[PDB]
């Protein structure tokens, strides 16, 4: 009974494998072989934000492109002002072990979570004056790895129990559950439109989910080890994935396969973060060898290196206007690059 | 500039709260118990020990959260469940992000010849074979950055807290001695 299903699954997998090779007529390398390279992209630390006691595990920019929020394992969630280097807020957490932190598009709320298995939504406006936790969303059986807002009311969250969950903050119970992953889901990425999102798990597989329906449209394979960071190409028809096999890979949603691999012999260390530039022509990685490498998305060439962090670089975000890139490290320092 | 001045006063308050927290964070010694969060005092010394029973048995990711931790508390019950514990210790001991952390080992619930053929030619009895089997893993790839502290507990629970306090003192000592190149 199990033999028939397990053999039929192998047949379907081969049918999809042969279909993808039928679409692969010319590789991305061939098309972008006859365009001028970006050259040397050298960027220097414009600001150095300091105040975190412990390692900075995750950060996220605002839509204003001015404020950014950071999370550290000491138990502090600090909202900064990039331009002035002044601290705006500093929130003490109930659980010190925090692994993700999001900043609402409106800029009203701020989410965070970690090993406590719970996602905390904090209200900044608060007419009273003080910043207090608005709603505390519980349901996930494993640690919370990533969380990302759609509006003020709903939040998408991937946890380390092989499940991503769409929440409704108003009522405070799961609207839709996303199942399919076999390993811990490590990162999320929302498209320009809030219709689709992609999640990379610890099973060397990334999956494209439909928020409205709640089922996996496409499954992307090609990575050799656990996928840590995933990020949408600004267009929304491709995404880059950074794994522990020391390779970034670009996928195409319509092609439904791998386009290009961003690997170099010198790198034998895992990739923690991934983010595109405004135009998407650059792709900044950030490795656990204490530095970050800027790639040429189209040509697989290496443009430059952001070196300055002593310890592991855990998070890496670009602004909505794409003016600067902020990389957080286990140093306990943010650095703004321009 | 008036608004820049207004934002400095807010930054001034926040900075005054961080310096107070900084002292509290450095004072407290973090522990990691695996076989949630609990805070206890021993001779007016703050310890903050976090359990990991809520998570799954796939550790390879969330384990990385702990390296700021002072020392790991490892418990091993005495199928071949004993060998599964050795393999878990080896992994934590050899990990790239845990190659600085010490491990306080606790043997509780006190055939071996069947699951271990080296015991037949061992003479020093069963307790010290299981202790040594963990020490051979610790001495192989140590490098003098971290050590293992074995302990036998009948699981009575009396005088368990003091043992962890004495071991915590030894780890910070050795950590400083090596910093001053005096060890």
């Amino acid at each position, epitope marked *: 009974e199990l033999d028939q299903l*397990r053999q039929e699954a192998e047949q379907l*997998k081969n049918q999809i494998r042969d279909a993808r090779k039928a679409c692969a007529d010319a590789t991305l390398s061939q098309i972008t072989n006859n365009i001028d390279p970006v050259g040397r992209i050298q960027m220097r630390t414009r600001r150095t934000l300091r105040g975190h006691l412990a390692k900075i595990y995750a950060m996220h920019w605002g839509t204003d492109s001015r404020l950014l929020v950071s999370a550290s394992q000491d138990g502090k969630l600090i909202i900064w002002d990039s331009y002035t280097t002044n601290k705006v807020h500093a929130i003490p957490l109930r659980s010190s072990w925090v692994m993700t932190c999001a900043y609402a598009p409106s800029g009203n709320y701020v989410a965070c979570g970690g090993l406590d298995n719970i996602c905390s939504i904090y209200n900044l406006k608060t007419r009273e004056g003080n910043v207090r936790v608005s709603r505390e969303l519980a349901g996930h059986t494993g640690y919370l790895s990533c969380c990302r807002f759609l509006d003020d009311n709903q939040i998408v969250t991937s946890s380390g129990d*092989t499940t991503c969950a769409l929440w409704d903050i108003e009522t405070g119970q799961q609207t839709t559950t996303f199942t399919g992953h*076999t*390993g811990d889901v490590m990162s999320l990425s929302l498209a320009p439109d809030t219709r689709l999102f992609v999640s990379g798990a*610890c*099973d*060397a*597989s990334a999956k494209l989910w439909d928020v409205r329906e709640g089922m996996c449209r496409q499954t992307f*394979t*090609g990575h*050799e*080890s*656990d996928i840590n960071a995933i990020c949408f190409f600004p267009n929304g028809n491709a995404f880059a994935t950074g794994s*522990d*096999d*020391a390779t970034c890979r670009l996928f195409d949603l319509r092609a439904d396969q791998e386009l290009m691999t961003y690997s170099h012999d010198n790198i*034998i260390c*895992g990739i923690t973060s991934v983010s595109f530039s405004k135009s998407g022509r650059l792709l900044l990685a950030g490795y656990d060898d204490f530095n970050c490498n800027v790639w040429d998305a189209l040509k697989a060439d290496r443009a430059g290196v952001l070196a300055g962090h002593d310890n592991r670089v855990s998070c890496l975000g670009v602004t909505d206007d794409g003016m600067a890139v902020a990389t957080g490290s286990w140093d306990s320092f943010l650095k703004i690059w321009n | 500039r008036n608004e820049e001045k207004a934002q400095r006063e807010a930054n001034k308050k926040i900075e005054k709260q961080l310096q107070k927290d900084k002292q509290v964070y450095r004072a407290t010694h973090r522990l990691l118990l695996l076989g949630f969060e609990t805070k206890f005092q021993v001779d007016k010394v703050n310890f903050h020990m976090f359990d990991v029973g809520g998570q*799954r*048995d*796939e*550790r*390879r990711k969330w*384990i990385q959260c702990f390296n700021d931790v002072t020392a790991i508390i490892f418990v091993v019950a005495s*199928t*071949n469940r004993l*060998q*599964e514990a050795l*393999n878990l210790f*080896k*992994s*934590i*001991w*050899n*990990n*790239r992000w*845990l190659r600085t952390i010490s491990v306080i080992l606790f043997l509780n619930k006190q055939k071996i010849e*069947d*699951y*271990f*053929p*080296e015991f037949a030619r061992y003479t020093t009895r069963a307790k010290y074979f299981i202790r040594d089997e963990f020490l051979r893993i610790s001495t192989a*790839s140590g490098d003098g950055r971290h050590y293992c502290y074995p302990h036998f507990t009948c699981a009575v629970d009396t005088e368990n807290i003091r043992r962890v306090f004495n071991d915590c003192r030894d780890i910070i000592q050795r950590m400083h001695l090596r910093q001053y190149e005096l060890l």
Partner: nanobody
């Protein structure tokens, strides 16, 4: 896609020999430390043996020590385990698993009962 297919497992007489083969594809074989794990009827997954990237560091469980021999071929992505003089307690489903990361000394979650980078598993029965 990471694939690990087990072959060469079946019904054998007690004191007989069996040779397991594990075909790997999707990942660079040489970079990863390869493992064998078995799950006996009505028991949990227990580690059996591992072999380093090159094939220098070789370690077993006391139960199979000096009776089982692990060997890896890099030229032909394949991991072998020669099983000599078998007894009924060896009767279990043997899986072929690799450590999650490449170029790593530590090997995590290989007996997790939900590990992704583990094979389908082959049946090995030792009966009269």
């Amino acid at each position: 896609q990471v694939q690990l297919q087990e072959s060469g497992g079946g019904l054998v007489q007690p004191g007989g020999s069996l040779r397991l083969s594990c075909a790997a594809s999707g990942f660079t074989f040489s970079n990863y430390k390869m493992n064998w794990v078995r799950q006996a009827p009505g028991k949990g997954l227990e580690w059996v043996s591992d072999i380093s990237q090159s094939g220098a560091s070789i370690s077993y469980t006391g139960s199979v020590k000096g009776r089982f021999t692990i060997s890896r071929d890099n030229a032909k992505n394949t991991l072998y385990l020669q099983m000599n003089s078998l007894k009924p307690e060896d009767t279990a489903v043997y899986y072929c698993a690799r450590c999650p990361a490449p170029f790593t000394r530590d090997c995590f979650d290989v007996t997790s009962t939900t590990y992704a980078y583990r094979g389908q598993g082959t049946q090995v029965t030792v009966s009269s």
